[PDB]
Design a protein around this ligand. Sequence first.
Ligand SMILES: [Cl-]
Ligand SMILES: [Fe+2]
Ligand SMILES: [Fe+2]
Ligand SMILES: [Fe+2]
Ligand SMILES: [Fe+2]
Ligand SMILES: [Fe+2]
Ligand SMILES: [Fe+2]
Ligand SMILES: [Fe+2]
Ligand SMILES: [Fe+2]
Ligand SMILES: [Mg+2]
Ligand SMILES: [Mg+2]
Ligand SMILES: [Mg+2]
Ligand SMILES: [Mg+2]
Ligand SMILES: [Mg+2]
Ligand SMILES: [Mg+2]
Lengths: 173, 173, 173, 173, 173, 173
Amino acid sequence: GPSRVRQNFHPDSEAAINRQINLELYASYVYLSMAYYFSRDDVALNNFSRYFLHQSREETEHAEKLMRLQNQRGGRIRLQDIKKPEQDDWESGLHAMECALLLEKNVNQSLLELHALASDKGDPHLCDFLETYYLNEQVKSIKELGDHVHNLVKMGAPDAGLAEYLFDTHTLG
Amino acid sequence: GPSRVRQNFHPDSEAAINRQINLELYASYVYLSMAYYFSRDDVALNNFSRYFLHQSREETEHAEKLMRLQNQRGGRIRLQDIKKPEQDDWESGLHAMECALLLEKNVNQSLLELHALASDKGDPHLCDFLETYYLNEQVKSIKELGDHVHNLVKMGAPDAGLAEYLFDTHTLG
Amino acid sequence: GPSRVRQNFHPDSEAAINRQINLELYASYVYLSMAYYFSRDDVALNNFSRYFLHQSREETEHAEKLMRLQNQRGGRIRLQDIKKPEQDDWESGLHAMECALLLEKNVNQSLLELHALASDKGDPHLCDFLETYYLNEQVKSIKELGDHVHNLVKMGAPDAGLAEYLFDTHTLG
Amino acid sequence: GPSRVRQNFHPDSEAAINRQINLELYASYVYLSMAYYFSRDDVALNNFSRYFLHQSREETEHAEKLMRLQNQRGGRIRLQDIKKPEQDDWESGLHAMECALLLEKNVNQSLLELHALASDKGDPHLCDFLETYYLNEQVKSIKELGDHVHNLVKMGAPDAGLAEYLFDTHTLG
Amino acid sequence: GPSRVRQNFHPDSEAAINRQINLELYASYVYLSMAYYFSRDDVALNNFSRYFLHQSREETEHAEKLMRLQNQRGGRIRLQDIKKPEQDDWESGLHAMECALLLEKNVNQSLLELHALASDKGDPHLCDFLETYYLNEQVKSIKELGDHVHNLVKMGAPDAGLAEYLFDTHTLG
Amino acid sequence: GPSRVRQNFHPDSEAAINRQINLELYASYVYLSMAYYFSRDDVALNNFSRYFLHQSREETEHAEKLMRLQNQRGGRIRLQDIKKPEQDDWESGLHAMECALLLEKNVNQSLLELHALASDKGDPHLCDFLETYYLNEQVKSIKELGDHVHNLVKMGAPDAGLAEYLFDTHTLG
Ligand SMILES: [Cl-]
Ligand SMILES: [Fe+2]
Ligand SMILES: [Fe+2]
Ligand SMILES: [Fe+2]
Ligand SMILES: [Fe+2]
Ligand SMILES: [Fe+2]
Ligand SMILES: [Fe+2]
Ligand SMILES: [Fe+2]
Ligand SMILES: [Fe+2]
Ligand SMILES: [Mg+2]
Ligand SMILES: [Mg+2]
Ligand SMILES: [Mg+2]
Ligand SMILES: [Mg+2]
Ligand SMILES: [Mg+2]
Ligand SMILES: [Mg+2]
């Protein structure tokens, strides 16, 4: 017996949504890691720290919106371990921005696969949800990180002593 | 000679939109019926009454938005009789909530068929309209009614004397 | 066993009130039809549209007040199909005003029959209700439509090109 | 080496977006032309002028939003000459409204082709962008121009001396 | 070469603090799970949901305060996977409250072990931190959950139909 | 038969004013190009972007004021294609500032030729218009661009990594 709410909601979509929830929580955790890297006494770039912390909290919102969608559609949320980030030392402002950019493109590819699946299962509600709340948000994030990486590289990060310091103060400040 | 406004608007879509307008008006009428059931002297659940009345007025808005779309696209509105509801006595708070839930799923299936037709006729304007204003609204409605049915059942409606009374006061109040 | 509220309320009055509810809902539907006629791209008289839409919503209020009276008196509301309007194309501003005037006189004759019945059944509560909320409202409506028809005719509607256009802007604007 | 931001963005979409940017700029220029036609001493319809000027500025916004999308997605903006409008003398209020209507339908057909291309290239971000910001805007524009053409024709434009004068004052005023 | 900030900070304390960070994040995840259990269509206790969501966000704050302490003292944060909760279906309002109570006592025992370690390593800064921000907070949480479990049991949860419903509305509302 | 408004307005002035309108529109387009260069992901100097966008909108105002003058004097506006800018890639902050400076001097030389023509045709109204609204505006623009080029060169643009970045933030910010 399915949910009395469930309608036109494919089991494969339910499962893909649970995989997406894990990926969003993972991304939250990556950014939380980055945030506290920047507030080390031997790094001390407070606006990089604030930036990544804000990203971490936004990833939690992305996760919750998918958990709500699961409930709305009569799916059942199935949580899995949240894997720790690949690094605990993020090396530099530039390196963390580059890692974030790769992570955002990977999440985007996941969301595009999810939309393709929704399209295959004739679920326009799911397609619209991803278009309204996920796809443009990812385009905006990737473009912003691309901008940041570009500026840091041009400024001489990470080796030029003033580069990360000034970018912290001006762009992220 | 078509409307001088008409563009990429399939006659089958025009007709399906007229069928949808009738269904929305019908749903308005069902809820109007339910609303005045609850204000009978031998039922007297005023917040159930207010709930269904609010649903009835929202269905009229859904109808009007489709009538406006028809005009916008250069279709011609073709009205049909609005059939009376299946019951004039809705038996209980629970039974009316269950009937509303079935009606919302039926309207949803209609809207999903309409989107499939819009998709087949390559009408992305029509697809977007249904996604923006109809499909999520139906998901939200069905989930809300599912919540209400669940609570009423658990509380012992309709036979437990306090159940509908307390649900009227707390959830719908 | 009657309603424990019912007193001095004739079954014939209960039935006539149910017939009146259907007529009010019908009138609502006629005006809704007219409203969306005027917002066609090949008619485009927006203040005619607004006028008829306002009339449509007021007819719904008339219907609801009768549904409430039914409940107040311990009658049982019995809904019937709402028949579609006689036309989907209302031809002109003048023609719609003339159709509205005929409809208002027909509704008035119905209400006068209802009062005669209430009088025959010695129901002064019912007589007063119709006098307070229905009879003067109909006199005012018929007089207003008579005024509008008169002006439109004098102005040269529907064939004189400026007539409906200017009446839309000045009288209904 | 592509943009480090670029993802799931087909070269054909990039090119079609550059063609759309040119068309939007062209439409801006057409309306700018119309605006200054209406403020000639031998035409002097100031509200027609204001109307077309407002349309011209909105077309520039449409162009810029596409230039931003190009950048967001990692495409490269490629500008081309903006061709002058077909006329410098727009003959009458009615004739300009009819020309605008044809132009809006042509732009709409272009945008529908662009959506079909986005659909073929599996770019739901691009599809959504066009649905959110372009397709409904075009439906609304075409319907509004259809309304205006209808009224002007009925009023006797362009030959009836009061028609354009009164429409300027009432509808566009 | 240690942190140039590090003073009187035992490697065993650094490690125990990293274990505590994982436990806090785990507790956040447990409550997030519970929160979305309560907003299922077949559970639909919205104030239970809000309660657990608030608990989840507070656990994140506990985690962050420990990550900040690590940085303050010149320790190095070492993140580990966050294990999924023991259940995805939390059975009832009462059962979730009982699970929360057990979890809070387990976290408390962990914090008491951490204080004993800080005491053994002569780290009064660490002892004070745990006393100021953790130990009383846990006493308050455990007492509150004890109160809630007591009331739910007395009310007849989970089998009495009104119990969880009324507790949701009154105590958690 | 000339405009009934036309007085002391030489056909050569009318033509030169139409050439000036094209040049102003061209300059608008050049700056629009520059603006969207700076918001590329591989350039990302947002205040350069804002600067050039503001210049682009001001050029449109210059064009419109000349179109209004044409109408005021009873001339007839004759629009021509707006040629695309010489580059779509503007290379650097410095290079775009240098290109803008050359463009402003070229527009200035055009306006000085126009004043010489107005002087030759004994049109003091035209001379005054150019003096009031064009000539000082160009002096101010050229001086400002000269200032900017000077600072960028001194700072080490384009090769010194901090130069354009800091000038974007401080001078244009
Ligand atoms: Cl008038
Ligand atoms: Fe995300
Ligand atoms: Fe509906
Ligand atoms: Fe779509
Ligand atoms: Fe009525
Ligand atoms: Fe009387
Ligand atoms: Fe446009
Ligand atoms: Fe905690
Ligand atoms: Fe200029
Ligand atoms: Mg591992
Ligand atoms: Mg029947
Ligand atoms: Mg019939
Ligand atoms: Mg040409
Ligand atoms: Mg495990
Ligand atoms: Mg060329």
